[PDB]
Amino acid sequence: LSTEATAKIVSEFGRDANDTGSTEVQVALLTAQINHLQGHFAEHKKDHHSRRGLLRMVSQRRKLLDYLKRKDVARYTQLIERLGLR
RNA sequence: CGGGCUCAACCUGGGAACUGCAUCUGAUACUGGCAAGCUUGAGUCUCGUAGAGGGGGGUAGAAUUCCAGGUGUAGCGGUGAAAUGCGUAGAGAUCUGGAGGAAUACCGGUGGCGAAGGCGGCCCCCUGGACGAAGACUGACGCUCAGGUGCGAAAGCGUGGGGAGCAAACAGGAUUAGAUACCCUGGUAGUCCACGCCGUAAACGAUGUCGACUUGGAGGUUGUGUCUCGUGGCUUCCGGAGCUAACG
RNA sequence: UUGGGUAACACUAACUGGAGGACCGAACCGACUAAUGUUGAAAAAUUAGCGGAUGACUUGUGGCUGGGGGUGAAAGGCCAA
RNA sequence: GGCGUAGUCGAUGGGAAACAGGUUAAUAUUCCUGUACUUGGUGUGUGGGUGAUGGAGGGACGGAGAAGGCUAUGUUAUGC
RNA sequence: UCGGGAGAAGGCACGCUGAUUAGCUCGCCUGAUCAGUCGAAGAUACCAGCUGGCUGCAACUGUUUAUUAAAAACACAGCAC
RNA sequence: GCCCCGGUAAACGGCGGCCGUAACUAUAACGGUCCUAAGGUAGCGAAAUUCCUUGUCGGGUAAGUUCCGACCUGCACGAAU
């Protein structure tokens, strides 16, 4: 994942200015990384190592979302709607 | 504690502590719940660093063997010593050429890296971790972590391929009182490649991880610095206090 | 295929789909045990049972290969009773 | 007596064209009645180009599962 | 070989009659409810697995003596030279 | 081409006998001694492939030359005969 490709995805999801660590922001990076990793599965069916690496990349997201929907349900439906998870 | 049956066991009277639970009231520092709010943490960001870290493909040289040619002697090979064996239609030794398989000098190191297993002839691609500086960011989003999940030498196993060398089992020659050992001549699986599986081990530094704290000296790897020295991380040795049954 | 748990590997539930020289069978196929029959129509049939049953199946017509032959998943089996 | 080319032969399969009705002691989508259709030849008219052999659709429309439409008939109706 | 084995096994109900409910557009379609009631027997008249255990052999379907043996015989995918 | 030597047993095959140690007795087990080189350890074995053998121990049964398990010197069982 390129630098600008990461700094741009954080801005489009950033709640406010300079927003780097947020529920909707974090999940954004994770989702992205997951998309690239999942696509990495379509090929190299042998890469069992990186396979494990996703269990967490998502367990974090699945936990962040669980935390989001738990506190604010509005920010939830909006987040998923923007990304496209579930 | 006192008293009663001659004592005691036993028993009586009184007293105290008396947990636990119900009711009412109060405090509320700490834990919990709700609401709001700061950076020196963790993580992250920016700029840099060392390395045999992992996966795929390609590639070089030396050596062993086989095949072809030349030459060529009478032996060569091999051992503690020999023999089997190979050789005058020409082995060995030697030169040239070709094919194939496996692992890969000087540098390598007492070095370095990876989470571990492991990983260095070299090159490229893909990908994990960690360290230093600026101290900027989120703003504590931390640490650990039953279960779960993945990884995990070698050996061995399934299918296909390959197979130079080496080599369990195995076929012989020696040694020996006997050797179904060591030594020697052959030799299958395997050792190798692709894929699937097993999941174990001195998987050992045999001292799980994280943070704080406690004299220093010396050698080495790496970043930075006002670099005959200061400082951060890593790898050894000797050691203060202290710790240990002892070794340490 | 859908839904759910999971990162994935995959798993579970439901649904769909329905293969399989598979099982029961219409028509029928095969045919172990006995009796009848045994100068039966004659070149081997009847009865009571019994077993297996969409395929490498069954069948009509036409055509091809012949004797020491061919053929034969070899039984010395078959090649016009 | 046998192996390639040109020709031909080989399955009432393939194969251009009609049904309905009536009639005989015995026959028929062949007789009769009505109607339809095909091929070949010629031409009155319309119309104003008439063609082996290989190749095209076509005939090889094959196997398995199956929806829907659907006939007369039958039936509900003891309707006509 | 989780495909299966399994209509395993085992047990109950299953008649008629009256009045109704549900599914569907409807059926002279289907699934049920309540009450009454007769026989020894209600799938009372048309088919039709008996079940279970141990052991020998071959794997199985299939093939084989058209006229006495289909059997542990033959073949078969697979493995090897 | 063959005699020559060597390789090959998924080549036709061969695998007898004896003593000691040791047990209450018999056998198995181990080594040797001899013959013809080895003499058999995986499994499993008197098994449809062993005479002797209705072999020995035993299950099971009132009893079973049947069968199953074990031992097993394997007359003339044993490796894709």
Curated annotation (Swiss-Prot):
Q: Name one Pfam family in it.
A: Ribosomal_S15
What induces or represses its expression, per the UniProt entry? Part of the metY operon that extends to pnp, also has its own promoter.
Relate the assembly described in the record: Part of the 30S ribosomal subunit. Forms a bridge to the 50S subunit in the 70S ribosome, contacting the 23S rRNA.
What would you give as a GO molecular function for this chain, any one? structural constituent of ribosome
Give a short account of what the protein does: One of the primary rRNA binding proteins, it binds directly to 16S rRNA where it helps nucleate assembly of the platform of the 30S subunit by binding and bridging several RNA helices of the 16S rRNA. Binds to its own mRNA, stabilizing it 5-UTR and preventing its translation. In the E.coli 70S ribosome it has been modeled to contact the 23S rRNA of the 50S subunit forming part of bridge B4. In the two 3.5 A resolved ribosome structures there are minor differences between side-chain conformations.
Q: Does the keyword Nucleus apply?
A: no
Q: Which organism is it from?
A: Escherichia coli (strain K12)
Query: Sorted alphabetically, which keywords does the UniProt record give?
Result: Ribonucleoprotein, Ribosomal protein, RNA-binding, rRNA-binding, Translation regulation
**Gene Ontology CC terms:** cytoplasm; cytosol; cytosolic small ribosomal subunit
- Give an example GO biological process: cytoplasmic translation
- Matching InterPro entries, A to Z? Ribosomal_uS15, Ribosomal_uS15_bac-type, uS15_NS1_RNA-bd_sf
Protein name, entry field? Small ribosomal subunit protein uS15
Similarity annotation: Belongs to the universal ribosomal protein uS15 family.
This protein's gene is called rpsO
Matching PROSITE patterns:
RIBOSOMAL_S15 (PS00362)
